Every structure is written in structure tokens, then in C-alpha cells.
Amino acid sequence: QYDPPTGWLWGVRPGEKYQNEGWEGPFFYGFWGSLIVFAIAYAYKPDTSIQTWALEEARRRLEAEGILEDPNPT
Amino acid sequence: MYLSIIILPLLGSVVSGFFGRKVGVSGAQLITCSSVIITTILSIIAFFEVGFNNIPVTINIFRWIDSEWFIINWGFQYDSLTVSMLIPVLIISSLVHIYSISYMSSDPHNQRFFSYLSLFTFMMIILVTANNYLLMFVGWEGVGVCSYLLVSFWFTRIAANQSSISAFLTNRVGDCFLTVGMFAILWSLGNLDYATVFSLAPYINSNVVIIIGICLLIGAMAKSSQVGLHVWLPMAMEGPTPVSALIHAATMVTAGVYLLMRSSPLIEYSSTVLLLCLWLGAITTVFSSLIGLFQQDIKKVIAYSTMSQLGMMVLSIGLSSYNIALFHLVNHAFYKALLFLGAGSVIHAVADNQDFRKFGGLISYLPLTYSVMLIASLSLVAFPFMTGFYSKDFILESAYGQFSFSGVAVYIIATIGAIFTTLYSVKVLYLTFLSNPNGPRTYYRLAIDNFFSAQAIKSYKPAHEGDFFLTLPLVILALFSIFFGFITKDIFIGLGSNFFVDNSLFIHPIHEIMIDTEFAVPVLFKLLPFIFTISFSVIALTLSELLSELVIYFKFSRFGYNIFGFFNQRFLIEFFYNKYITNLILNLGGQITKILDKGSIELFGPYGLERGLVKLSKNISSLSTSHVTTYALYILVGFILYLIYNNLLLDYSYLLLIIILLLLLMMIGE
Amino acid sequence: MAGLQHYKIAMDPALVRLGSMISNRYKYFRWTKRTALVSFMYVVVVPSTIGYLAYKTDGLWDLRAKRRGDLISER
Amino acid sequence: MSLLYVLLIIPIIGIFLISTIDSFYFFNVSYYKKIALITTILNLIVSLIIYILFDFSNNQFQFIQENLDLSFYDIYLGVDGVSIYFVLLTTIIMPIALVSNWNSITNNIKSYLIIMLLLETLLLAVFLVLDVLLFYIFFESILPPLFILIGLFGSSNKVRASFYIFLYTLLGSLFLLLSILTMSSIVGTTYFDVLLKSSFEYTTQLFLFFGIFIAFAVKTPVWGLNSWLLRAHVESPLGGSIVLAAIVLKLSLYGVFRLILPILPQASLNLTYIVYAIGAITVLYASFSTLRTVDVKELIAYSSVAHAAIYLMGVFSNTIQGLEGAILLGLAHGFVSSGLFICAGGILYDRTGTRLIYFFRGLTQIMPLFSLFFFILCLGNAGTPLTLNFVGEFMSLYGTLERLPIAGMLASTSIIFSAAYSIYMYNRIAFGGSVSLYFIDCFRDLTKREFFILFTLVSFTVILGIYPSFVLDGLHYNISSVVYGIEPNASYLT
Amino acid sequence: PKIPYPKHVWSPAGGWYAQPANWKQNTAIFGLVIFGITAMVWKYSAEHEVRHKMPEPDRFYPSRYWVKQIKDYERAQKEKQ
Ligand SMILES: CCCCCCCCCCC(CCCCCCCCCC)(CO[C@H]1O[C@@H](CO)[C@H](O[C@@H]2O[C@@H](CO)[C@H](O)[C@@H](O)[C@@H]2O)[C@@H](O)[C@@H]1O)CO[C@H]1O[C@@H](CO)[C@H](O[C@@H]2O[C@@H](CO)[C@H](O)[C@@H](O)[C@@H]2O)[C@@H](O)[C@H]1O
Numbered sequence A: 001q002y003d004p005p006t007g008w009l010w011g012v013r014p015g016e017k018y019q020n021e022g023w024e025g026p027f028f029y030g031f032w033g034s035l036i037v038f039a040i041a042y043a044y045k046p047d048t049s050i051q052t053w054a055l056e057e058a059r060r061r062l063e064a065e066g067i068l069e070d071p072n073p074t
Numbered sequence B: 001m002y003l004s005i006i007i008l009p010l011l012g013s014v015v016s017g018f019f020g021r022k023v024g025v026s027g028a029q030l031i032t033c034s035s036v037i038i039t040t041i042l043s044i045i046a047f048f049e050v051g052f053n054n055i056p057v058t059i060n061i062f063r064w065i066d067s068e069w070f071i072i073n074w075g076f077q078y079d080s081l082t083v084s085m086l087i088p089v090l091i092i093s094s095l096v097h098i099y100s101i102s103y104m105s106s107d108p109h110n111q112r113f114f115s116y117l118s119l120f121t122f123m124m125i126i127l128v129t130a131n132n133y134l135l136m137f138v139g140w141e142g143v144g145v146c147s148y149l150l151v152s153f154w155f156t157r158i159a160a161n162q163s164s165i166s167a168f169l170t171n172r173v174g175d176c177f178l179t180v181g182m183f184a185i186l187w188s189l190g191n192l193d194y195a196t197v198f199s200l201a202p203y204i205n206s207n208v209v210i211i212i213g214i215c216l217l218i219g220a221m222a223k224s225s226q227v228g229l230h231v232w233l234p235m236a237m238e239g240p241t242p243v244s245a246l247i248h249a250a251t252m253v254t255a256g257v258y259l260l261m262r263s264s265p266l267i268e269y270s271s272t273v274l275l276l277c278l279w280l281g282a283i284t285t286v287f288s289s290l291i292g293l294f295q296q297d298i299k300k301v302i303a304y305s306t307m308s309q310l311g312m313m314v315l316s317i318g319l320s321s322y323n324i325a326l327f328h329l330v331n332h333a334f335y336k337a338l339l340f341l342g343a344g345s346v347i348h349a350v351a352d353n354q355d356f357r358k359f360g361g362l363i364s365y366l367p368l369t370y371s372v373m374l375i376a377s378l379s380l381v382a383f384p385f386m387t388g389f390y391s392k393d394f395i396l397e398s399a400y401g402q403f404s405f406s407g408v409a410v411y412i413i414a415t416i417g418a419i420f421t422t423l424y425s426v427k428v429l430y431l432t433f434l435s436n437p438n439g440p441r442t443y444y445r446l447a448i449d450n451f452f453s454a455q456a457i458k459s460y461k462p463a464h465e466g467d468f469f470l471t472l473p474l475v476i477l478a479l480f481s482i483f484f485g486f487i488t489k490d491i492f493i494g495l496g497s498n499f500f501v502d503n504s505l506f507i508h509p510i511h512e513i514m515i516d517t518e519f520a521v522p523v524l525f526k527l528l529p530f531i532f533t534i535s536f537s538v539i540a541l542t543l544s545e546l547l548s549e550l551v552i553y554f555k556f557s558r559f560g561y562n563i564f565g566f567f568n569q570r571f572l573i574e575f576f577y578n579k580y581i582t583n584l585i586l587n588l589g590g591q592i593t594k595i596l597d598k599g600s601i602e603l604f605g606p607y608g609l610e611r612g613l614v615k616l617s618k619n620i621s622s623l624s625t626s627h628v629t630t631y632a633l634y635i636l637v638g639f640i641l642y643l644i645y646n647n648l649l650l651d652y653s654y655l656l657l658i659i660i661l662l663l664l665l666m667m668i669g670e
Numbered sequence C: 001m002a003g004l005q006h007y008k009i010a011m012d013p014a015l016v017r018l019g020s021m022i023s024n025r026y027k028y029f030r031w032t033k034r035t036a037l038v039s040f041m042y043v044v045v046v047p048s049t050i051g052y053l054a055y056k057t058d059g060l061w062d063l064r065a066k067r068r069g070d071l072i073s074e075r
Numbered sequence D: 001m002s003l004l005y006v007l008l009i010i011p012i013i014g015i016f017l018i019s020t021i022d023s024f025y026f027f028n029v030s031y032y033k034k035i036a037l038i039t040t041i042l043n044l045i046v047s048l049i050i051y052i053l054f055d056f057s058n059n060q061f062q063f064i065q066e067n068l069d070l071s072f073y074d075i076y077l078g079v080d081g082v083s084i085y086f087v088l089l090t091t092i093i094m095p096i097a098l099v100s101n102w103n104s105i106t107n108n109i110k111s112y113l114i115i116m117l118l119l120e121t122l123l124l125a126v127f128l129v130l131d132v133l134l135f136y137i138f139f140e141s142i143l144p145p146l147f148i149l150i151g152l153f154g155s156s157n158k159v160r161a162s163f164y165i166f167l168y169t170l171l172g173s174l175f176l177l178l179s180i181l182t183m184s185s186i187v188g189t190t191y192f193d194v195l196l197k198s199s200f201e202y203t204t205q206l207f208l209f210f211g212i213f214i215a216f217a218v219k220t221p222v223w224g225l226n227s228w229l230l231r232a233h234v235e236s237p238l239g240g241s242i243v244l245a246a247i248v249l250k251l252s253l254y255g256v257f258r259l260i261l262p263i264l265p266q267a268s269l270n271l272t273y274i275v276y277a278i279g280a281i282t283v284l285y286a287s288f289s290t291l292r293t294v295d296v297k298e299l300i301a302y303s304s305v306a307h308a309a310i311y312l313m314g315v316f317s318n319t320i321q322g323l324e325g326a327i328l329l330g331l332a333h334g335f336v337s338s339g340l341f342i343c344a345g346g347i348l349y350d351r352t353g354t355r356l357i358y359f360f361r362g363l364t365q366i367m368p369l370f371s372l373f374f375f376i377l378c379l380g381n382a383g384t385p386l387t388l389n390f391v392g393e394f395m396s397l398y399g400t401l402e403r404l405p406i407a408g409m410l411a412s413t414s415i416i417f418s419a420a421y422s423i424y425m426y427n428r429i430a431f432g433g434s435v436s437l438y439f440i441d442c443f444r445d446l447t448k449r450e451f452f453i454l455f456t457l458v459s460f461t462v463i464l465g466i467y468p469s470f471v472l473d474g475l476h477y478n479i480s481s482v483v484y485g486i487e488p489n490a491s492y493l494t
Numbered sequence E: 001p002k003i004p005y006p007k008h009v010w011s012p013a014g015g016w017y018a019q020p021a022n023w024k025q026n027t028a029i030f031g032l033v034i035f036g037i038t039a040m041v042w043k044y045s046a047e048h049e050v051r052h053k054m055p056e057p058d059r060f061y062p063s064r065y066w067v068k069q070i071k072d073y074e075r076a077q078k079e080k081q
């Protein structure tokens, strides 16, 4: 035989509801909202990493040697 | 499908754990078992795609760590070794989820337990599917964290707290050596993906190979509980029984063995690491086999039998025989999990007693449990044509088949280990089932014989067998323990078998011994284990239930008493480790906190300065008497001192010495 | 006792007294043969040993791209 | 107006609003704390905007403002990759530190908020100034507010703690100042783009190294110069502790990348064995004493000492991975020590009023949400993979090993001992029996506030532990500029 | 018997003998979620896997039915003579 799931989440007794301390607005909407927006903004940020620029030159130089096939031969 | 094997056990784990309140006990069991069983089917399909058709599969998703020369990806490689490892891990995990549905039916925390069971499975899969050393290390620590959580699952018990710390810390000692070995690979080769390391291994400096090889051997020792770093695994028996069968007997204890086999293309080019593997495995075989015969708890005997089989694998790896090491790993996982689950049946049947001294009878009470426990035991002792016969016995003759002194020596060593395997195998089955009842009435009191008058409808508890979920895995694992070795030896051994031609296992031709093992080994040494097995079983079975006083005479001799205690106390390693390592570190910290940080550092630092400078300040202030005649003399003496210093062209060092002297005097009161 | 009201705790006086001794133990350190020897060992000897070993092996070895026919030693 | 000046200006505006809003409305202190929190959110939003515009492979300082009005002491602001992540750490930590003290600060709330807002401006200015003497001015400016913060809001031993941190930091800093003034006299300024082109002679470098090192070893801190931290980090209010361990310890690390690597390369390479012996000794000694520390907040404070030893050894490795790993570890330490201080100085302390380990046991039974986050944080402290702590420890340790193998091998032993004290402390508090019999009342579990500051901190360590490229990609190009050395067939090309 | 426990303790994994009356409905949703994520992972795998040998036509290789690399090879190989 099993028991019904019990317990007070955030310590709120079953009769009452959660009371806001005043931090919830700025933290959920400002702090977390901005971080979520920034993450979406970061998907559209151009890649400016040294790796991306250096991989492209490395590929051309290894295309020059007999290592990588040239998509545009001569 | 290949990614779906990786993420499916993780998905079930997060539902069981982080949404247990939503699905409850039954929902958690349905989701986890379903998510593990489906993964197991895909693993069987994968074993055919990758192994039988020899098509390795590469998958890379996103980079993990990218710094100049190190590029580590979230990437997975499936090769013949990978799918070989996944078969025991997924099947036994599926049968241990199912077995737990019944075994832990009365535990109050089923959701958390099944979340841990599915999270361990996911970390094990990560460990064997990763295509680079560091991603494997994630699953290496992943299984270690899951092992710590499952050993401490009943966390209000102090002894299970001590055991969980032991498993976490001892494995971390081996993790430190594995990290330095990865550092040595990075330093020499520029990164740690498997293909790079194994393509460059024949050419790298031979001393570099030793440093890396020894480093990854020590990590293997801890995870596979070899004599140096073994103590955690016996203490890990404090967790619930299905944890022992799954984590500490069949899958996670084999991660060290997996590390050496996956590293075979590198460590083949180091005879030093191979020779250290060879002897380390042999020591572990006899060390644990001796200890297990003198254990009073059934789980502790079985844990030392796991340690002795894992030593046999490491021994085999030291003979450049990774395919035979892999064969034994797969076969052992089946029948050793059977023994653990059969033991769990006994422990359930007699109300959680775990001591041989309170068993007896039960042969008519647990007939199914006895049968599969007997089937598993004959596989463990490599009885002819059982599953364990095809793996262990080949390891032995392979040791002889390498006609070298070390190879002959380990053969003899592992033969004595085989002798005591038979001894404690007899000890378990006889003391549990075949002997007279050493336990109380309650275990054996049946309703057929009238004992009660008013409490007749209930109040009998006669130590019966378990339910379907408890017994179905036993039947399945019993079948693998009989036929699986015969069905599959041609894959793993063959004679010129090409199952591992994706280079999963590399055997350098100079390290081949298999021809001599098949043809050059004399027949006497081939059947010697069976002669010993069939005789010490007679010797053990006769010493009990027929003699039974001779062993007692030995025990009550001072020689025997000391022998009994030494092996029961596990060569006194836990005693000497606790005395001179653990307590040594605690006392070092005690000294540092008491004599230095809250001591000498305070006095030769801020606190000493505060004491002295307050004293110096008060003594100088004593000169300020406000007596105008005294200040007048002070001005005068200061005047003369300035006149002397300049007129006589005094050495500046004299002036500084004078000032220091004046502070000295003002240090002293009165 | 410290700002916000906390829960009732059976504050055991012996354990509290042990906690007070640990906070104030610096006030009672003295130089003895034992304390001087321990302090000298931890502060001078062991660090100077690691310092000497680090000094003498600085630049001794390099692993990068070392093949057979080469040495790990650089010096 | 530059975005970097906006970063320094927003908290000053919030200080002004907090101190004047009594004239436009007894104003509730909730209003004060709302103003300060929103002030920190906007500062974080600005730093996020800067990062979106920031370029990962530029060796020119970005978002700078031309002055053309030179004076004796002019504040020049600029950002590159080796400072951009410290700016982000400061603007993420500051709102969390404010919420962590939302209820536990009961008197002098206006003073508490103004100090924290002023601390935000001063710490940010440390990362953004482009002059070496400007670095000292901001590094030392945080001391009086820190002295007042400890003394107005600290625990029973707050006076001794406030004095220790002030006098230790001042004493070390005075030796750094003499080093900076010598540089200013030889070169004529301490502006980065001019001083970094100077080449000090070797003996000058040696005596410049000493004096900068003395200060950075007092601030790391190295073992033996760390009693100020064991006092101040414990006696501080919770928000003070988060700022002190997440950002203030990072000043000496970012200081190494500006004050030692480019201008003292020869002294740094010749003295690495002295740095490594101290860093190795600190790793072992701090680890053993952490194992015997019975104050829960002091134990989390002492583990900061052991972690900072590894980033200090990584920063002197003169290898790319060791330098990047040092920054990665610094950042990962900021999230983990913030979470462990919240767990101890904010959850245990608020509920019991005590910090002694002897009174805690079996908290998992009644506080499952606390034990879940506390455990994940204790794995981060042990450098468990999937946390940013493993990535930083591994890269830092690899660079230390490759620079000086014996020092790396000893430093590697931290993988064993950080696990020991993290797992030991977790087991004694969350596990280790049923609920402690010293608790008369039962305890509530995490409040929504406590849950969402721990969840946020735990989120950062795990997300960056799985995709650390989010920081490394913006580190690679700029951190190349602080490496010293040459390859024979790669150098002097023609 | 079953152990007593506090009813005020809220735990995400359920607590002590936790099974909601609607556990089958909730299990159905979560299993549906698990299928949906797994299918997405399956789609990713079948497109990003890499092989260097293809299976023979007569051998049991069910991945041939969804993996892009093999599907392209089999379709191209059907153009013979
Ligand atoms: C977990 C460890 C498991 C066990 C590891 C065993 C590994 C065995 C290799 C040991 C090794 C690698 C150390 C690299 C460490 C890298 C980072 C650490 C690991 C990072 C993960 C340390 O060797 C160093 O040791 C130094 C002293 O310690 C010595 O330097 C100086 O020593 C003193 C003055 O001589 C000064 O007093 C000291 O001040 C100096 O410095 C040198 O011997 C050397 O630099 C290299 O050993 C080498 O020694 C030489 C001489 O025999 C061998 O050459 C031989 O010479 C011919 C005739 O001679 C022989 O005919 C021929 O056979 C061979 O050509 C090599 O073949 C090899 O054997």
C-alpha cells in the first residue's frame, strides 16, 4: 500500500499560499529574463573566435599541400 | 539509435528522480525499467551492426574543451569492444531494475533508488562509448558518484556512511593517477582522442609509454579493486543487494579492465606495464581467494570472489590476451550477478540475516534459489562445459602457454586461488542449503506441522521463495551461465578470429602465445584445475557434515587461530591503512590547525605584533610625565645626540643600531 | 541571539565550550622545543625541500612529440 | 558616454536614489532593497549587452572613450578578453548576493545596500581601468567599505576580523605600490598600452616581482598569509562573504595577467619554482586543515585557499591551457563558493544560529531540496566533471605539470583531498544518521528564495561545465599575448 | 509495517510511500515526453553518424532503413548497368 504524496513546497502550508518577499519580480523577470534574452541574442552573434579564422587559413594551406582536396581546383 | 542508447537511461533517471512525486512508485519503475530494456534491445542490435558486420560508427555532437592543441568533443565511438562491453552492462542492468521491483518493494524510497539505478547505467554507457580519454573520465567519475550514492542509500546508518566515503576516496586516489596519465598523453601527443593516441603509440618514446601505462594501471587498480586499492569494494557491500550485483560485481568493477583493454594499442608497446599487470592480477587472485574463505557474511564472500575474478582478467591482460580478458569479463558478469541475486533471495527469505552461522536447511525451502546458486557456482569454478569454463580455464593455460617464468609462476599462483575459490564456493552452498539448520525455528517452522492453536491463520513466516520479479532474472541468468560461453567462444577466442579487426584490441605479433597454448601445453596442466576442483570439493564437503571436528581442531590451535584471524581480517590492510594513512592525515591537519595557523603563525604574525607593540607603546608613553623640567632635559639630550652624529661623522649603521637598542629597552618594562 | 530568530536548538554547553576554546587557542600558544620544532619543520624544511626539488628539476624534461630514438631529458 | 562608464555609473545612481527617496514618500525597507536589486539587474543587463558586442580576436582595447583632456590621474576604461569574464562574474554575483541577504539584514539596511552598491562600482572599476596605478587605486578603495561592512553587520568576532583584512591587505598593497611607483618612474606612466611595450632590465624585474608577489600572496591568499581570510570570510555577513570570495580573491589573479606576465617575463620564469613551492605547500597544508575545521563557514572559507593555489600555479605555467584554466577555475570557484556560503552562512546559520559542525547531522531527512543542491555544490568543490570546476582544475593542473612536473604532481593530490573534505563535510551534515537530536524544532526546507539562488548558481557551473567554450572562445586570442617563449623553426620569420 | 515520517517534508522524488492517485496519467505524459525527446535524438543520430564501410545488401543491418549515409549509398548503388 502506497501513501499520497505530501509535503509543503517552499514551506507553504496547505491552507495558505506563497507570499512574495519583494525580490521575485526583479529576479525572475529582470535577472533571469535578461539571461534568457542574452542566450537568444548569442545565437545570432557573429563568430569572432581566433579558431574560426585560423581554421579557414589552415584548410587552404593544407589544400595547398597534398593533404586536403580542393573544392575549387585551380 | 546509437545516440538513443546513450540518452534513454538518462531520461528515465531524471523522471524517476526529479519527478517521482508525479509518477509515484509504479510510474518510476515503469519508466526506468522500460527505458533500460529498450536500450538493451538497441544494444543487441548494435552488437550485430558493429561487431558482426565490422562497421564501426563515429558520432560527434559538439566540442567539449577546445584549447589550442586539445580539442575534446562530446563524441562517441562504437567498435567491437564497445558493443562487447554493452551486452553485459545493459542486460544485467535490465534484470536488476526488474529484480529491484520486488526486492525493495517495502523500502520507503523507491523512486530515488530507481533513479540511481538508471543514472549508473547511463554513466557506464558514457564510459565505454566515449571516443577520447577525458569523456571516458566523465563516465569514470559518473559511475563513482553513482556508486557513492547507492552505497550510502540507507544514509541514516553510520557504517554505510563510512563505506560510501571509502569508495569515493579510494577511487579518487586512482582518479589522481588516471589524471596525470591523461596529462602525460596530452603533453606528448597534443590531445587524448583514441584514434590519435593509438595511431602514434608505436613511435613515441618508450619511457613515455611506461609513465602513461603505469599511471593508467594504478587507476585501473582502484576501479577494479586490485590488491593495492582494493579495500573499498568489500566495504561497498553495505548498499542494497541489487546494487552489489549490478555495480560492484558485474559492470563498474570492470571499468578498470575496460581501461586497459581499450588502451591495448598503447600498452602493447610497453612490456613493463604488461609485466606489472601480469603479477598484479595474480596477487589479487590469491589475496582475495584466501580472504573469502574466512568470511562470515555471504555478501562479503561473494565480494572477494569478484575481486579474485577481476584479478584473473588483469592477469590475462598481462599476457597480452585482451580478448580472453574481455571474454571472462562478459561471462563473469552473468554468473556473478546470478550469485548476488540468489544471495539476495536467501537474505530476503530469512529476514535479512547475512551470516552463514545462522543458515542451514533452506534446501527444501528455496529450491529454485539453490539450483541457480549451484549453477552459478559451477560456472565460477570453471566446471567443464559451463560458461565460466571457457573463459577462466583458457586464462590459466594461456599463462602456461606463455613459456616464461612469470607465466608459469602466475599459473601456479592462480591455481591455488582456484583451489580456494572451490573452498568458499562449497562453503556458501553447504552452509546455506546442505547443512543442518543453525538458524532458529522461525526460518523452518512450516504450517504443515501443527505448532500453534489460535495463531494458525498467520504467524508462520516459513522462509519461502520470492515472487516473479524476484525469480525471473534468476532463471534468465541461469541460462547464460550454462550456454553463453559455449555459444560465443569462437567470437572472443576463435583461433584466428577477426572480430576485433577495427583495432579495438591490438595484439602485437611478438606477444602471441595462443598457438603454444593450444598445442604446446601438456594435457596434465590443462586438466589440472578440474582435478583440483573435483577433489577439494570432495575434501571440503567431507570436512563438513562428516568430519566437522578437524576444522575445529585447527581453529582452536594457536597456529590455526592466528591463520583464521589474519585471513578473516583481510591481511590486516584496513587496520594498517586506517592507522598509518587515514589517521596520519587527520593528525597532520590537527598539527597544522593547532601549532601553526592557530599557533606559531599568530605569534610570529599579527597576534605577536599586537602584544609587543601595545607593550612598546605603553612603555614609550611612560616617558611623557608632563614634567616640564623632564621634557627640557629630553630636548637637551636629543640636541647633543644630533650634534654627535654630525660632528663625529658617525657610521650610519651605528645610528640604526642605537635606535634598535632603544626599542629593545622599551620592550622591557621598568 | 544573532539578528533573525532561529529555531530552538539544544545548545550543549560542553560543545559550545569546545567551540570557544578553538576560537581563543591562539591567545595561549607558546614557544617550546616541541612547538618550535614542528613550526620549523612545516614552514622551513618541507617548503624548502619542495623548493629545492622544483629548482633542480626545472627544465629537466619535456614530453612533447618525443619519439623512440629521443630522450625525455632536455638538460 | 561609454558603456563601461555606464557600468560604473548605474550603482552610484542607485546609491543616490536609496539615500534620497525618503524625501518623496517612513519608507519601507522593502522599497530600498527593491531599488538596490533593480540597480544590480540593470548593471548586469549592460554587461550582457557589452559582451554581445564584444569581439573575441581583437588586440585593441574595446569600448574605450577618448579623453584628450589629460590630467595627473585620469580614469581610462577599456575591456579585452582577459577582463571581460571578471566583469560578467561581478555583475552576476552582485544580484545573487543581494537576494541572499534579503531577510537576514535587519538593522541599518540603507547602509548595507549603499556599501554593496559602492562595492559593485569599485570592483568593476578594478577590471576596466587601463592604467597600473588605476588598478591599485580601485584594488585599495574597497577596504574602507569592507571594513565598515564587516563591522556593522558581522558576527561576534567582527572587530578582529575587520582589522585583520584591512591591515593585511594594506600591508601587502604598500609593497605593490612601491613596485608600481618604480615602474611609473622608469617608463613615465602606467598606462597599459605604453608600459607593456617597455622592457625592464632583469635585476629591476626581480625586485619588481618581489613586492608585486608579496601583495598577491597576501591576497591569494597563500597559506601562512591567510588568517585574515579565515576571520573575515567567516565573520562577514553572507552578502559580504559572497563578494569577498567570488570577486575579491579574483583581483590578485587578474592582477597577475596585467602586472607580471607582460612586463616581468624573465623574473616570472626564473622564480616559478619559488611560486610553485608556495603553491604546492598551500595545496597540502590548507587541505589537511580544512579536514579538521569544525566551523562550517570556516571549512568553506579554507577550501577557497586550496582552490586559489591551483589557479595561482596555473597562472605562472606560461602555457595557454594553464592560463585559460586559471581564469576558468577562478570563475568556477566564484559560483561554487557563493553556493556553499549560501548553504552554510545563509541556510544553516539562519536556522540554527550556530556554525559548529557538531550540531548537524542527517539533514537530508527533513531538507531534501537543500541536500540536493548542497551535494551538487560539494561535487563542484571536489572538481567533479560536468562542473566548470573540473575543466579549470584539469587545464590549470596540466599547465602546472608541464611547466614543472614535481609541482604539478603535488598539486594534483588536490583531486584526492578536495574530494576528502567536500565529501566529509557533505556526509556529516546531510547524511550520517537521522536528524540531529540537538534540533528541538523541526526545520523548514529551502524557501523559494534559497532555492532560486542555489539553482541559479548550480545552473552556471553545470552549463559551463558542459560547454566551457562559452568562455574559452573569448579567451584564446587575448591570452596568447601573455605567453613568453619561442619555437625555433616558428620564430623570426622572413 | 511501514515507517512513520513527517507529512510536511516536500521532496521532488516523492518522499516515503508516494504514489499519486493519477500516477498512470502522469506516467503516460512523461513517457510521451521521453518518446518525443528520444525521437529527436534518433533523428539527430541517423543524420550525423559516420561509417567507413557500408553493410552488405543481404545482411541484417536495420540502420540501413534510417541512416542518411547508408541510404544515399544504397540509392546511388541501385543505378547499375
Ligand atoms: C609514475 C612513475 C612510474 C615510474 C616512471 C619511470 C620512468 C623512467 C624514466 C626516468 C627518466 C624520465 C623522467 C621524466 C619525468 C617527466 C614528468 C614526470 C611524469 C609526468 C606525467 C628520469 O631521468 C632523469 O633523472 C634525473 C635525476 O633524477 C637525471 O638528471 C640528472 O641526474 C643527475 C646527473 O646525472 C643529477 O644529480 C641530476 O640533478 C640531474 O637532473 C637524469 O637521469 C634524467 O634527466 C629518464 O631516465 C633516463 O635515464 C638515462 C640514464 O640512465 C637513460 O639513458 C641511458 O644512458 C646510457 C648510459 O647512461 C644507457 O646505456 C642507455 O640505456 C640509456 O640511453 C634513459 O634511458 C632513461 O632511463
Ligand SMILES: CCCCCCCCCCCCCCCCCC(=O)OC[C@H](COP(=O)([O-])OCC[N+](C)(C)C)OC(=O)CCCCCCCCCCCCCCCCC
Pocket (backbone or CB within 6 Å): B013, B014, B016, B017, B018, B020, B108, B109, B110, B111, B112, B115, B119, B137, B138, B139, B141, B142, B145, B146, B149, D364, D365, D366, D367, D368, D369, D371, D372, D375, D376, D379, D380, D384, D385, D386, D387, D462, E009, E011, E012, E013, E014, E015, E016
Ligand atoms: C555534477 C553536478 C550535477 C550535474 C548533474 C545534475 C543532475 C542531473 C540528473 C541526475 C539524475 C537525476 C537525479 C535525481 C535526484 C535523485 C533523487 C532525488 O530527488 O533526491 C532527493 C532526495 C529525496 O529523497 P526521497 O524522495 O526518497 O524523500 C524521502 C527521503 N528523505 C528522507 C531524504 C526525505 O534527497 C535525498 O534523499 C538525497 C540527497 C542527495 C541527492 C543526490 C543528488 C542526486 C543527483 C546526483 C548528481 C549526479 C552527478 C553525476 C556525476 C558527475 C559526472 C562526472
